[PDB]
Amino acid sequence: DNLSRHDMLAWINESLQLNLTKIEQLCSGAAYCQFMDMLFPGSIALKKVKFQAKLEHEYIQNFKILQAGFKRMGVDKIIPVDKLVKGKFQDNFEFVQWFKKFFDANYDGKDYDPVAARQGQ
């Protein structure tokens, strides 16, 4: 029941008001951090997230932040960070399919402004 890459990008971009053009760009970890903030406000150290990360060390730090949020919230998932940060399609697509299912199961209707969330950092 995997979404197409096109439908997945549309969901990400609309939900978070982002401008991704490639599934591979999820390698930065920033979108995942914002989704976790959206699901569980306060679970993520948003002040430390690099929203427009350009280099691997920045991606890794974003994923460290995500991992801490998962741990705090009792989410059972080892994130394959070492693979994801390389920006290849297969690993990133596999993880996003899982993540969307996770998000869909945990969404509880609370208002979130994803643009405001990126302001004032």
XYZ file of N, CA and C in Angstrom:
363
model
N 0.832 -1.241 0.000
C 0.000 0.000 0.000
C 0.854 1.274 0.000
N 2.022 1.194 -0.631
C 2.903 2.346 -0.763
C 2.339 3.411 -1.706
N 2.465 4.675 -1.307
C 2.146 5.803 -2.179
C 3.193 5.903 -3.272
N 2.801 6.475 -4.407
C 3.761 6.833 -5.438
C 4.655 7.950 -4.908
N 5.818 8.106 -5.522
C 6.729 9.175 -5.148
C 6.061 10.545 -5.298
N 5.227 10.693 -6.325
C 4.554 11.948 -6.614
C 3.500 12.285 -5.554
N 2.701 11.291 -5.161
C 1.698 11.490 -4.115
C 2.359 11.702 -2.754
N 3.483 11.029 -2.512
C 4.216 11.221 -1.268
C 4.765 12.646 -1.150
N 5.393 13.133 -2.218
C 5.886 14.508 -2.215
C 4.763 15.526 -2.016
N 3.614 15.293 -2.646
C 2.473 16.187 -2.480
C 2.002 16.234 -1.023
N 1.958 15.079 -0.364
C 1.554 15.017 1.034
C 2.538 15.801 1.917
N 3.832 15.573 1.707
C 4.864 16.253 2.483
C 4.779 17.763 2.276
N 4.746 18.177 1.014
C 4.785 19.598 0.700
C 3.551 20.335 1.195
N 2.375 19.727 1.057
C 1.165 20.376 1.532
C 1.102 20.402 3.049
N 1.445 19.285 3.686
C 1.336 19.188 5.147
C 2.257 20.164 5.860
N 3.458 20.353 5.317
C 4.471 21.158 6.001
C 4.780 22.474 5.290
N 4.063 22.745 4.193
C 4.313 23.919 3.370
C 5.788 23.972 2.966
N 6.242 22.873 2.365
C 7.608 22.735 1.901
C 7.648 22.767 0.382
N 8.869 22.737 -0.150
C 9.099 22.832 -1.588
C 10.057 21.756 -2.090
N 9.899 20.540 -1.566
C 10.733 19.421 -2.004
C 10.410 19.072 -3.442
N 11.428 18.705 -4.208
C 11.213 18.236 -5.574
C 11.616 16.768 -5.717
N 12.298 16.228 -4.702
C 12.823 14.857 -4.734
C 12.643 14.168 -3.387
N 12.253 12.898 -3.410
C 12.202 12.079 -2.205
C 13.564 12.085 -1.506
N 14.629 12.088 -2.302
C 15.995 12.103 -1.791
C 16.274 13.259 -0.825
N 15.573 14.379 -0.995
C 15.776 15.551 -0.131
C 15.355 15.323 1.321
N 14.594 14.257 1.560
C 14.226 13.876 2.919
C 15.439 13.425 3.730
N 16.563 13.217 3.046
C 17.829 12.886 3.693
C 18.291 13.918 4.724
N 17.734 15.124 4.683
C 18.167 16.151 5.626
C 17.586 15.973 7.020
N 16.508 15.193 7.130
C 15.835 14.982 8.411
C 14.953 16.121 8.905
N 14.988 17.267 8.224
C 14.246 18.441 8.703
C 12.731 18.255 8.655
N 12.212 17.706 7.556
C 10.776 17.454 7.451
C 10.307 16.506 8.552
N 11.058 15.434 8.789
C 10.676 14.492 9.845
C 10.625 15.154 11.210
N 11.618 15.996 11.501
C 11.618 16.762 12.745
C 10.350 17.615 12.873
N 9.958 18.284 11.786
C 8.746 19.097 11.827
C 7.487 18.267 11.983
N 7.429 17.109 11.332
C 6.275 16.233 11.492
C 6.150 15.790 12.941
N 7.276 15.509 13.594
C 7.239 15.100 14.998
C 6.774 16.230 15.920
N 7.213 17.458 15.635
C 6.746 18.661 16.338
C 5.227 18.808 16.154
N 4.757 18.562 14.934
C 3.335 18.662 14.591
C 2.486 17.630 15.347
N 2.980 16.399 15.432
C 2.275 15.336 16.154
C 2.303 15.532 17.658
N 3.476 15.902 18.169
C 3.754 15.924 19.605
C 4.517 17.198 19.948
N 3.804 18.329 20.036
C 4.473 19.595 20.320
C 5.348 19.516 21.571
N 6.595 19.965 21.444
C 7.543 19.929 22.547
C 8.443 18.703 22.569
N 8.148 17.717 21.720
C 8.923 16.471 21.676
C 10.276 16.620 20.980
N 10.414 17.673 20.173
C 11.557 17.893 19.275
C 12.239 19.193 19.678
N 13.574 19.183 19.714
C 14.375 20.395 19.927
C 14.436 21.221 18.630
N 13.315 21.850 18.273
C 13.205 22.589 17.004
C 14.231 23.699 16.835
N 14.622 24.326 17.944
C 15.604 25.406 17.883
C 16.941 24.930 17.303
N 17.190 23.622 17.383
C 18.453 23.044 16.930
C 18.381 22.475 15.520
N 17.179 22.406 14.947
C 17.002 21.849 13.604
C 17.517 22.829 12.549
N 18.243 22.311 11.562
C 18.628 23.103 10.400
C 17.638 22.821 9.268
N 16.720 23.762 9.032
C 15.615 23.526 8.095
C 16.056 23.443 6.633
N 17.127 24.160 6.302
C 17.700 24.115 4.955
C 19.146 23.611 4.982
N 19.330 22.464 5.626
C 20.630 21.809 5.721
C 21.189 21.514 4.333
N 22.506 21.626 4.201
C 23.181 21.424 2.921
C 24.270 20.356 2.965
N 24.702 19.992 4.169
C 25.844 19.096 4.331
C 25.505 17.943 5.257
N 26.165 16.805 5.052
C 25.865 15.581 5.794
C 25.870 15.752 7.303
N 26.839 16.498 7.848
C 26.910 16.635 9.302
C 25.651 17.296 9.858
N 25.061 18.190 9.068
C 23.806 18.853 9.440
C 22.635 17.868 9.377
N 22.610 17.029 8.341
C 21.573 15.997 8.224
C 21.619 15.079 9.437
N 22.832 14.671 9.808
C 23.030 13.751 10.920
C 22.511 14.351 12.226
N 22.802 15.630 12.455
C 22.310 16.297 13.657
C 20.779 16.371 13.672
N 20.158 16.676 12.530
C 18.695 16.651 12.451
C 18.132 15.276 12.802
N 18.751 14.223 12.284
C 18.295 12.874 12.615
C 18.545 12.502 14.075
N 19.609 13.026 14.688
C 19.860 12.815 16.121
C 18.705 13.431 16.932
N 18.289 14.630 16.530
C 17.167 15.319 17.139
C 15.872 14.490 16.992
N 15.640 13.952 15.796
C 14.481 13.097 15.544
C 14.503 11.844 16.424
N 15.666 11.193 16.483
C 15.841 9.987 17.302
C 15.507 10.253 18.764
N 15.967 11.384 19.294
C 15.650 11.767 20.670
C 14.148 11.957 20.869
N 13.481 12.520 19.864
C 12.031 12.705 19.919
C 11.310 11.372 19.918
N 11.742 10.463 19.045
C 11.178 9.108 19.029
C 11.339 8.458 20.402
N 12.542 8.541 20.975
C 12.793 7.911 22.271
C 11.890 8.491 23.355
N 11.784 9.816 23.379
C 10.994 10.516 24.372
C 9.531 10.097 24.299
N 9.048 9.864 23.077
C 7.640 9.584 22.848
C 7.303 8.097 22.840
N 8.306 7.260 23.086
C 8.104 5.814 23.115
C 7.868 5.182 21.756
N 8.268 5.866 20.686
C 8.172 5.305 19.339
C 9.205 4.194 19.201
N 8.774 3.038 18.697
C 9.671 1.908 18.469
C 10.164 1.920 17.036
N 11.278 2.587 16.782
C 11.824 2.577 15.438
C 13.271 3.002 15.455
N 14.151 2.101 15.033
C 15.541 2.466 14.797
C 15.613 3.127 13.414
N 16.007 4.393 13.389
C 16.150 5.131 12.132
C 17.498 4.770 11.496
N 17.496 4.316 10.222
C 18.757 3.955 9.561
C 19.496 5.202 9.069
N 19.926 6.030 10.018
C 20.484 7.347 9.722
C 21.657 7.278 8.751
N 22.584 6.351 8.992
C 23.785 6.238 8.164
C 23.464 6.047 6.691
N 22.383 5.324 6.418
C 21.918 5.117 5.053
C 21.183 6.352 4.530
N 20.223 6.855 5.302
C 19.373 7.958 4.838
C 20.148 9.203 4.424
N 21.162 9.565 5.212
C 21.881 10.823 4.976
C 22.686 10.842 3.674
N 22.868 9.669 3.063
C 23.533 9.569 1.763
C 22.669 10.045 0.588
N 21.391 10.305 0.842
C 20.521 10.926 -0.145
C 20.176 10.067 -1.345
N 20.109 8.756 -1.145
C 19.701 7.862 -2.222
C 18.216 7.549 -2.137
N 17.627 7.223 -3.283
C 16.185 7.053 -3.372
C 15.637 5.899 -2.542
N 16.179 4.704 -2.751
C 15.588 3.500 -2.181
C 15.429 3.567 -0.669
N 16.511 3.894 0.034
C 16.458 3.940 1.496
C 15.546 5.056 1.989
N 15.611 6.211 1.337
C 14.750 7.325 1.716
C 13.275 7.069 1.450
N 12.978 6.375 0.355
C 11.599 6.045 -0.003
C 11.014 5.012 0.955
N 11.803 3.991 1.282
C 11.403 2.988 2.259
C 11.061 3.636 3.599
N 11.936 4.514 4.086
C 11.679 5.150 5.371
C 10.460 6.080 5.341
N 10.305 6.857 4.275
C 9.156 7.762 4.236
C 7.818 7.003 4.177
N 7.794 5.832 3.538
C 6.571 5.029 3.493
C 6.179 4.629 4.910
N 7.160 4.184 5.691
C 6.920 3.854 7.088
C 6.470 5.090 7.867
N 7.162 6.204 7.650
C 6.897 7.399 8.432
C 5.490 7.928 8.173
N 5.045 7.900 6.918
C 3.682 8.353 6.641
C 2.634 7.507 7.359
N 2.832 6.195 7.365
C 1.920 5.313 8.085
C 1.911 5.633 9.583
N 3.094 5.881 10.133
C 3.225 6.305 11.527
C 2.481 7.625 11.787
N 2.697 8.603 10.918
C 2.045 9.901 11.076
C 0.521 9.768 11.015
N 0.053 9.019 10.025
C -1.379 8.800 9.825
C -2.035 8.162 11.048
N -1.316 7.270 11.722
C -1.832 6.556 12.898
C -1.789 7.393 14.173
N -1.007 8.472 14.171
C -0.797 9.280 15.377
C -1.357 10.693 15.313
N -1.735 11.128 14.117
C -2.388 12.424 13.944
C -3.677 12.454 14.762
N -3.910 13.561 15.452
C -5.105 13.676 16.281
C -5.780 15.032 16.115
N -5.618 15.628 14.939
C -6.405 16.785 14.549
C -5.965 18.122 15.091
N -4.850 18.168 15.816
C -4.437 19.442 16.403
C -3.864 20.404 15.374
N -4.277 21.664 15.487
C -3.814 22.730 14.605
C -2.297 22.866 14.677
N -1.691 23.143 13.529
C -0.252 23.367 13.432
C -0.022 24.280 12.262
N 0.756 25.335 12.484
C 1.224 26.173 11.390
C 2.695 25.855 11.132
N 2.976 25.097 10.054
C 4.348 24.649 9.816
C 5.297 25.767 9.380
N 4.741 26.833 8.805
C 5.538 27.979 8.386
C 5.947 28.777 9.621
N 4.980 29.100 10.474
C 5.293 29.763 11.737
C 6.320 28.983 12.558
N 6.225 27.650 12.539
C 7.169 26.825 13.274
C 8.623 27.039 12.849
N 8.834 27.454 11.599
C 10.180 27.707 11.103
C 10.647 29.148 11.312
N 9.766 30.017 11.802
C 10.124 31.404 12.088
C 10.724 31.555 13.480
N 11.475 32.631 13.683
C 11.970 33.000 15.009
C 12.962 32.055 15.658
N 13.649 31.237 14.873
C 14.545 30.265 15.477
C 15.870 30.886 15.945
